[PDB]
Symmetry: C3
Subunit: 338 residues, 3 copies
């Protein structure tokens, strides 16, 4: 199972349970199809592409115990992004890994300059143990997009730099821990009518775990991507952490650092509360790194065990729910805007 540059990756994956790339070599792949579980040992190779993606389309089989596994592999989606081009349906095609019904492990890989999601995971029908760790993302529209009913995955110890949206979140119950983002407009996005919902749609969404993450310089002092983001049927204004869905609950949120990590809690299920727990909230001067909740749900939001500076604004959360005192608190019913 040794796959040379120029040989058909499709043939090699069909013929072998495990494939080893030539160490450090350069590949050029386009619309590869994986139909049964295969392990790839990338050996520090690089996979380039051109034209409409994805680079690999992975047809899953959740009954089969053997996962698809990709280790130690670089994927390049092309040159540096034009970050001003509006996102579109045709650009959603520009993926590294499009995975349906995924039982998959992605470890120690790098993803550079994808026009859409570097990694997209969807479910063919509504109802895996997915793991994405130690990966690097640079210059990508979206880092990892999990569609509805892709649940209970783990994305941890990954580094995101210069990505518009790190986690395009739909499917529920993922653990996202120990991840670093800098100069990314959005680390966490969840709302209705997203891209990359997949065949199960926007079902049992979000409500997972977001711990020990850093989202720095989202809205100020490094990020280059636009705030305004085109969904399929409306335009929104992203934030480092953006949540707008009255029919969904937020994830558990503890141990995270926000240095210009602006946050907008626009709407969530009324039978819930939310805590910004054990966090570091630094912002200012001016309206930079602002944290804001919908006035109608502010009594259900708390800021507990947080540290911060005077310049960090907290908008609409009542004073009684901020223990201990952190930043500067105010009421402004114009915030947060969608």
């Amino acid at each position: 199972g040794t796959l040379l540059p120029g040989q058909s990756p499709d043939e090699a994956f069909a013929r072998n349970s495990v494939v080893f790339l030539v160490p450090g070599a350069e590949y050029n792949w386009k619309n590869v199809v994986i139909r049964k579980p295969v392990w790839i040992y990338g050996n520090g190779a690089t996979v380039k592409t051109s034209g409409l993606g994805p680079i690999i389309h992975i047809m899953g089989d959740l009954d089969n115990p053997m996962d698809v596994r990709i280790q130690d592999l670089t994927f390049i989606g092309g040159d540096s992004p034009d970050r001003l081009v509006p996102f579109s349906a045709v650009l959603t095609n520009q993926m590294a890994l499009w995975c349906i019904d995924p039982r998959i492990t992605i470890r120690g890989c790098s993803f550079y300059n994808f026009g859409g999601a570097a990694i997209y995971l969807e479910r063919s029908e509504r109802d895996g143990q997915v793991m994405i760790t130690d990966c690097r993302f640079r210059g990508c529209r979206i880092g990892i997009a999990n569609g509805g009913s892709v649940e209970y995955g783990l994305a941890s110890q990954n580094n995101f730099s210069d990505c518009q949206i790190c986690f395009n979140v739909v499917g529920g119950n993922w653990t996202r821990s120990g991840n670093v983002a800098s100069n990314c407009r959005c680390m966490y996005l969840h709302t209705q009518g997203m891209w990359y919902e997949g065949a199960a749609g926007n079902f049992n969404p979000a409500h997972g775990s977001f711990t020990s993450n850093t989202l720095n310089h989202c809205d100020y002092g490094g990020n280059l991507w636009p705030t305004e983001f085109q969904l399929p049927d409306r335009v929104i204004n992203l934030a480092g952490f953006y949540f707008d869905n009255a029919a969904a609950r937020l994830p558990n949120f503890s141990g995270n650092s926000q240095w210009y990590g602006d946050m907008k809690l626009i709407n969530f299920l009324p039978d819930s509360t939310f805590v910004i727990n054990g966090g570091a909230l630094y912002g200012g001067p001016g309206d930079t790194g602002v944290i804001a909740v919908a006035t109608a749900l502010a009594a259900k939001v708390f800021v507990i065990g947080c540290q911060g500076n005077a310049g960090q604004q907290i908008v609409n959360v009542p004073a009684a729910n901020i223990i201990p005192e952190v930043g500067t608190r105010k009421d402004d019913a114009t915030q947060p805007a969608a």
Copy 2:
């Protein structure tokens, strides 16, 4: 054979004895039974599968902590059967049905899978009780592993200490962490449809030669324990210990002579909890948790009335149907769920 090669049908015992590093045939199927490792070796699984037969374990690892080389096993699947009978009472004979039995472990296990073990998939013990001031011997790491259909995931006996069990995924196991040995870090693990993620009490299975010594008091952070008592788990609540029966919970602690781990950043959607007894010179906090339960008595968190003043619930979110029993209202900041007193809870 070539050095470092091990084909199916060849002797695993002989290959490990003659090599410091062994590479398996990529993707191949192996069939191994009562294999003995007597010195440190690394195994590169290369996506292989190992099946077995009879009373296990598949590998018995005789560790030497004075040797600085770890036994390292990577990228290897272990299968202990077709699918679990979940109704059989657990027993002394079933404790044999292990993948890895490790004594005095200096070990790294990573990228591995464990399916349908009748006992603990991984059992770690000491040949003797460790009362030295050389702490955390072995520096054990178990990470990026998947467990499913297993009676017990990882069992760490007395005096196997300061291990790390992180970024693992447990599906359909009765007890993920059978906890005896103290000071382990367990972080960022995902459990779904497992009756119990964390068990510690007196008179446990898998205590090893050191016994129930210096137990628990570790770190338990950023973990998810979902659908433990409702809406997914299929294993029985009733669980047979060597000398008594208990009723498991997602998190079960009953030991007057031991302290609970640090507990912060954990998600509990039907992750029931029973704090039955712990050492009095201690406090416990459910810190920065997500506590979702209801309707009815589903996902219930309960503390013994005698010790309730020592338990706090700080920085937690949750829904109305989440019950929190016996913890005083003043100890819950901010308010979460529906608080109640009930001196009959928790039962053992």
Copy 3:
């Protein structure tokens, strides 16, 4: 590249992008130089050395997207450490890896008995996505030293035994999560005039994330390394967590165990607060595992959601800042001493 013991490492690294070592074999390398990115597959090998270090000198290129990667390799700096000799400028040379302008991944490696920092990362000018995970450190003066402007790294799931200073922290914005330390005098050090600041100096320091870590038996237990530590211009008295810089901010601190994990918060930037969040704080009998904050900054320090025993001492933190009540609290203007 299959590099054998006795062959020239330098020439091997210059001619291949990826190199595989002989599995299990012993190597002896001294002042090896890496000038272009390269991956080393260690295969459970061991690298010994002699004379003035470092073992490998790695010249980084931050513009090249291929990282330098070292996996599954053991580095040995001696048979056992010399712990009581005063630290010095010449001894700073006794390193495994010296990394200038690093884009580096170190995974599953082990580091034994280094007289300076096992791993030293520095920046050749003031302004990497660096990752150090699943590594073992035994017997080292210093585990990981990150210089100024070496930022946004990740050091996680590492284990430290019998090291003087696990993390010599200068450069800002690191995520350090899920690491275990026993019998190490100090897990986290940050002050002014440190060793290993690097050409960029003491710039934009610390203020990262320190979550889910264990720092046990720092001042009581089996630790052999002196509390007295020679900096270039003075001697300090180490603790488990040591912070003394009026011009820098502390990291976010959540989910950490401190069983005889003494802590000294001596000075930090006034425009900030600090929380010991979600902690386990166990100490005593006597003055063991003591946590103390400078009286002038005490009102900015909180202890939120922590558990402990009676013998844990918390010094100068006001009673109103400790929620819930944990351990034994007192005032003493003489602590912390530097």
